[PDB]
Structure formats: structure tokens, C-alpha cells
Ligand binder design. Structure first.
Ligand SMILES: *[C@@H]1O[C@H](CO)[C@@H](O[C@@H]2O[C@H](CO)[C@@H](O)[C@H](O)[C@H]2NC(C)=O)[C@H](O)[C@H]1NC(C)=O
Ligand SMILES: *[C@@H]1O[C@H](CO)[C@@H](O[C@@H]2O[C@H](CO)[C@@H](O)[C@H](O)[C@H]2NC(C)=O)[C@H](O)[C@H]1NC(C)=O
Ligand SMILES: *[C@@H]1O[C@H](CO)[C@@H](O[C@@H]2O[C@H](CO)[C@@H](O)[C@H](O)[C@H]2NC(C)=O)[C@H](O)[C@H]1NC(C)=O
Ligand SMILES: *[C@@H]1O[C@H](CO)[C@@H](O)[C@H](O)[C@H]1NC(C)=O
Ligand SMILES: *[C@@H]1O[C@H](CO)[C@@H](O)[C@H](O)[C@H]1NC(C)=O
Lengths: 206, 49
């Protein structure tokens, strides 16, 4: 099933404060009114050149994500698990199970990295050997459909970790979520007097 | 004159009112010249004029 992106999925493309200015950036963005896939299952989804991911939950139903070329111990796989107490980010040649319900993996080997710390919205990029997470949690009127209107995702996590990713999955506890793929688009971004991005033009749209 | 993490420049390092988000390290002018900087030790925001 599919849904429109409804102009969501903009994020800050630089770690640079800009304000009272319109800035053009050619970058990997979710296009305006793009064709996002919709879910309520957790398939071996493609990752392509990057993902917008969003979910609406009232009881913390999702518990994270996993990424790689294989999702098998032949290669390094990136994992983000949000357990009952912590966000745990790991890169290992994991041996994952048939469904990452929360029993995500049997074992881990050849590890190279670790990091530890409403509508939920995320963007994942894996470019030139970095991996980046941007996010926002957005309060909304209903529990099960992607809203109209605009807000820009702030950078959350930023990792110099060099993985190759073509597949990803969603972790679940024992809810409506949406997946959209980034395209290399020029966006004209409106940075307001507080330097927050309040609006954008997708120069490819129309 | 100053050097912030290798950002050479000159100016008057006025204490900034600008509301840097916690990830942002530098501010830029409409030209690419640097307009503000986060101090790498105190992590306050300074204007560069
Ligand atoms: C959620 O994950 C964190 C990892 O970030 C777990 O933290 C470890 O907890 C044990 C005690 O149970 C400590 O000895 C370790 O030092 C902790 N590791 C880190 C990196 O902090 C945490 O236990 C997990 N939560 C639950 C409920 O199991
Ligand atoms: C960890 O990854 C390495 C590759 O980086 C694997 O290395 C092979 O290990 C076996 C057993 O030691 C050797 O016979 C091969 O020659 C190694 N390959 C290379 C290219 O050196 C290793 O298999 C991985 N770990 C596990 C547990 O499989
Ligand atoms: C710029 O930032 C300030 C916050 O520092 C915004 O002011 C707040 O706006 C909300 C609106 O719901 C009020 O509840 C707060 O009381 C305001 N705080 C202060 C200190 O005034 C302001 O709206 C922002 N401006 C723009 C254009 O985004
Ligand atoms: C969305 O994408 C699928 C292919 O992935 C296609 O079959 C469907 O018609 C598309 N919908 C629109 C409105 O473009
Ligand atoms: C670095 O120096 C500043 C003072 O210039 C101090 O406030 C800060 O805590 C120091 N950072 C660390 C990590 O010790």
C-alpha cells in the first residue's frame, strides 16, 4: 500500500547555522508528494540511497532498526535497538533471526563500532562512509494516518562508520508506519529569524 | 585575530544572540564568510563581525 509524502521529510543539510535567508541545497531529500510505502509486518525492505521513516505510536510499539547488504554474518550489519531503557547502536557481523521481535540476533562477531544514549519521524543517510540519523517527534491529532503540514528534522546521530547498506528492517515488541526513499533533489530552504527551517521548495516538483 | 579549530579569521567576537541548535558548529554569511562560531571549550556562541 502507498501514501503521499505530504511535503514532510526535510532536514538540516548542513551543521551550519543559517538564518533569515533562503538557501539552495542539492541533497538527498524525500521529494514533495512522493509515493511512500505504508505498513502496520516488517519486511526485508530496500534502503536505496536513503530512507525517510515515520511511525505513529502511543505505547512504544517499535523498538528500532537493522541495516546492511545481507543482514547475515557474511558482512557487517548496522543495528539500532531502542530497548526498555537505552538506545544502543552496534556494528557487527550479526547472525540475525527470521523476525527481529523483542530475540533479534543469536551472536555477533568482527565488531567495529558502538554508540549509546506522537508521530515519530526519521531520515537515514549512508553516504561517502558516514551514516546519519535526523529525527523529530511530532504531536498530532490521530493515531494512524500521516499528517499534512511541514516541520524540519534536526540531526540526532552522526557516525563515521563505513557500512554498505541495501536492506533494512523494523524491530517490534511482542502500528502504522511509512517508508519513503530519498532522491538527489535541489531544495530551496527557508531559514527563519531563529534559524529554523520553516518551509521548503522542492525545485523538481512542478 | 582568532583560530577556532583551524578557522582562522579576524573580527570582534561579540557574544551572540543567535539560537544555534546543539549540532551546529559555525554560522555563515550570505557570502560564505563565517558569521558566527561556537567556542570549542565553553560551547557558547560568538558573532564574528
Ligand atoms: C539496554 O541496553 C543497555 C546498553 O546500552 C544496557 O546497559 C548495560 O546494562 C548492564 C546491566 O544490566 C551494565 O552492566 C552495562 O554496563 C550496560 N551497558 C552500557 C553500555 O550502558 C541495558 O541493561 C539494557 N536494558 C535492559 C533493561 O536490559
Ligand atoms: C571475520 O572477518 C574476516 C574477514 O575480514 C574473516 O576472515 C577469514 O577468516 C578465516 C579463518 O581465520 C581465514 O581462513 C580466511 O582467510 C579469512 N579471510 C581473509 C580475507 O583473511 C573471518 O572469517 C570473519 N570471522 C568469522 C568468525 O567468520
Ligand atoms: C523564536 O523562538 C522563540 C523561543 O525562544 C519563540 O517564542 C516562543 O513561542 C511559543 C509559541 O507557542 C511560546 O509559547 C513561547 O512562550 C515563546 N517564547 C518566548 C521566549 O518568546 C518564537 O516564536 C520563535 N519565532 C519564530 C518566528 O519561530
Ligand atoms: C506508487 O508506486 C508503485 C510502484 O512501487 C506503483 O504501482 C503505484 O502506481 C504508485 N502510485 C502512484 C500514485 O504513483
Ligand atoms: C573545556 O574548557 C572549558 C573552559 O574553557 C570547560 O568549561 C569545559 O568543561 C572543558 N571541557 C572538558 C571536557 O573538560
Amino acid at each position: 500500500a502507498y501514501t503521499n509524502s505530504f511535503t514532510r521529510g526535510v532536514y538540516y543539510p548542513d551543521k551550519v547555522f543559517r538564518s533569515s535567508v533562503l538557501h539552495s541545497t542539492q541533497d538527498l531529500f524525500l521529494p514533495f508528494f512522493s509515493n511512500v510505502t505504508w505498513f502496520h509486518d516488517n519486511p526485508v525492505l530496500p534502503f536505496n540511497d536513503g530512507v525517510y521513516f515515520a511511525s505513529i505510536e502511543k505505547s512504544n510499539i517499535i523498538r528500532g532498526w537493522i541495516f546492511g547488504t545481507t543482514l547475515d554474518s557474511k558482512t557487517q550489519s548496522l543495528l539500532i535497538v531502542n530497548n526498555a531503557t537505552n538506545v544502543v547502536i552496534k556494528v557487527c557481523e550479526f547472525q540475525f533471526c527470521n523476525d527481529p521481535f523483542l530475540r533479534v540476533y543469536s551472536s555477533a562477531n568482527n565488531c567495529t563500532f558502538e554508540y549509546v544514549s506522537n508521530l515519530r519521524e526519521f531520515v537515514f543517510k549512508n553516504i561517502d562512509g558516514y551514516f546519519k540519523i535526523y529525527s523529530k517527534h511530532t504531536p498530532i491529532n490521530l493515531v494512524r494516518d500521516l499528517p499534512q503540514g511541514f516541520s524540519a528534522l534536526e540531526p540526532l546521530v552522526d557516525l563515521p562508520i563505513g557500512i554498505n547498506i541495501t536492506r533494512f528492517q523494523t524491530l517490534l515488541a511482542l502500528a502504522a508506519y511509512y517508508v519513503g526513499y530519498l532522491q538527489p533533489r535541489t531544495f530551496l530552504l527557508k531559514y527563519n529569524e531563529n534559524g529554523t527551517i520553516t518551509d521548503a521548495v522542492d525545485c523538481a516538483l512542478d | 585575530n582568532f583560530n577556532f579549530n583551524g578557522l582562522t579569521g579576524t573580527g570582534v567576537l561579540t557574544e551572540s544572540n543567535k539560537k544555534f541548535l546543539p549540532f551546529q558548529q559555525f554560522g555563515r554569511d550570505i557570502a560564505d564568510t563565517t558569521d558566527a562560531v561556537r567556542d570549542p571549550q565553553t560551547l557558547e556562541i560568538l558573532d564574528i563581525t
